[PDB]
């Protein structure tokens, strides 16, 4: 029955008045069916007959979606909601398992008829008006309105949980031990005691709630360890996700791929290795839901790589607030990194991946940082703190990049791990030029319209070269050029560009890239003994350019 | 206290609605902190718990002000501000004395604690709502709303401005040369007295406040100097410099005249008359890079001239008080940071450069945040309004760590940046 709880007073958006939408009658058999239910309803107090004064109305419906037994009431409240003031967002998040406390005995509780058990703001009831249709369509009208949280209203889940909390306050205090996660109609009670006293506390709780119209599982805390919960297999000493079966066809569509990848990520929380660069690397510029997407070679292999992983089962362990949180990262390859958080070397609290920015030439150090960052955030949301990091980078390779790097960076405390691959600098650029080094004044220039270009150079030693290029661009060429200087230069070289862009790119120190060319370049910087790239202004600024800008 | 004062009715801007900002995730440590602080305020009536009919929300953090063994609650009323005090910048605007930057020593006193006495307009309260977070989403945030003028909210000083100028009256009477600007929770007493007498006049003032309006400021040192004791004295008159300085050298090379034709060529955008064709022509050849070459006598008239156009400031550079101030900071190295405060590209209204510790507690972040509070405070003194920082750092790292070394009661506006390219050569 209905609780003695006080009501969260509700209002309608500014200036708006209640909803007025007349009922479309039909199916008189249903028409009585409603009154049938409605009656045992007003009976229980969930609603009440109302005098034809102050009326409004919302569409009343009756349906049976099941293995037929009971016809059911349905009150689409949309146009009502549309008019109800905003509330406080309900926890639109979900207690991630990785941060749950290994507890002794855990009980869950299905609060019944939640919403209905809680009353409704006395002066907001009017707007919950409806009307079951006439036997014959001549309007005798059966008028009712809600005295509780109407099944589909906007302000419902809010005020429900609002009420649930208050109600549980004394109890959660009368017994400070017992933890209680609350989610929708459910209540997850956790304790560290014996099935005897734990089972006894439930009853306390269970009966405390009933003193406020909140009914609970009569089969004395009906718990199904482990619980299929929000896509999680919850055991009392391990967690996972069971229904993780990825389909295999021979015709994939933008849509099928989406669903696939989504599933693949979800898996990531705990399955060491799930890669996804390859499959998503397919959905681009094209957003055509049911368009035939040809699986790729890598997609096929990556999808295959994931299967062998997924094939086998892997569990998770819960949080011991007593130990230290450790997070470690390993670098996969194509701009991919994976990691896992722990407190025990065989156990694992959770795992996950991290993918490079989608479009730029990046760096294994910056990325490693971007990763350490991600985890720090996640870690804070879940556990309440930051973890100690075990990173595949030497305190020296790092401190060197951040001390060179133009941007602030504060990586919390970490220790080195010798497990390769090893993050590192594949090439440093000389700060001051090279004496005795050949000087290449490189340059590029392409015809925007005609899509043709030229890359060349002119050295101090009189050496020139002008290579032709097709399907290129001012930029392409401007790197095409450097690549040329490095190709014809000796083990020691000085290069001069008129393009900040080309400079900048290299200046960054990318080791990998989605640019055949920049890789062509990176590969050569590495082989060099000493490289000095320097920048001089373009047109007016014309150092050794007087020679390059022309020919090229 | 216990004194029902009438309530200055507050209204947000035209067709504007309360703030609905997400409450960032905190550390258990900090939750626990705030929890207690609020549990207290509620105990003192300063605040109250709300129901779910309050859709509104403004972020809260925990920090330690004077390093102290305990924390402070720092509410980020940055959104609610734009949605109100920007008409409590008018309906109650607080005027900015253009001479306080002129004093010799500006000391800053925290008065935010006066506010807690004035009850807040009941109809507005619903907007001051904040939410203490939960870990891993177990329970739902703890919900509170203010019943008294809040702190980070610019409507608070504004409303108090009355009681203030009153209290401060039989004191500007006596000491008339002292200037006192109030910007939020901070009082800014400026004077020309000798370092020490001033420091005295302050305690004088400070004790007045306490004596008079029970308004309590704070004691920096415990009269005990551990070799690590301050008080917060600012000295504005000595706030100018001209960091942009071509290098001084005996022998130059291709690489040198070159890096120089750059920085120099680029100055043109900011300094009206400086062309360098006769100096740069000396490069039109494909000479080696290490090759040393002497500076043409003819061209050197440019290096000379320009060396001088770099001593006398820009012209059409005035302060538009309809516009907001922008502060761009750049990582310089070894603990040094350069910064410009402008309004329109290339027309700076000030340029500085923080630095405090090269390699001890040298932490990019901590530095950046401290430099941010410096650049700020200066401007709060110079123009009576805080800028918006284009910060050279990853949005998330910043979001995670700023609250760590922050000690100000206000908070500015910021955004994260691409990269300072050729702009680093501003050292
Ligand atoms: C058994 C997992 C668990 C742990 C490890 N620790 C706890 O304190 C609690 I309460 C738990 O039960 C939960 C946690 C989350 C959801 C439910 C409800 C399950 C369902 N359906 C129970
Ligand atoms: Mn070019």
Coordinates of C-alpha atoms and ligand atoms in Angstrom, one line a residue, chain A residues 443-444 474 478 498, ligand 2:
Chain A
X443 CA 61.4 23.4 -51.2
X444 CA 58.1 22.3 -52.6
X474 CA 51.7 22.3 -51.3
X478 CA 57.0 20.4 -48.9
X498 CA 60.2 27.6 -45.9
Ligands
LIG2 MN1 57.7 26.2 -50.2

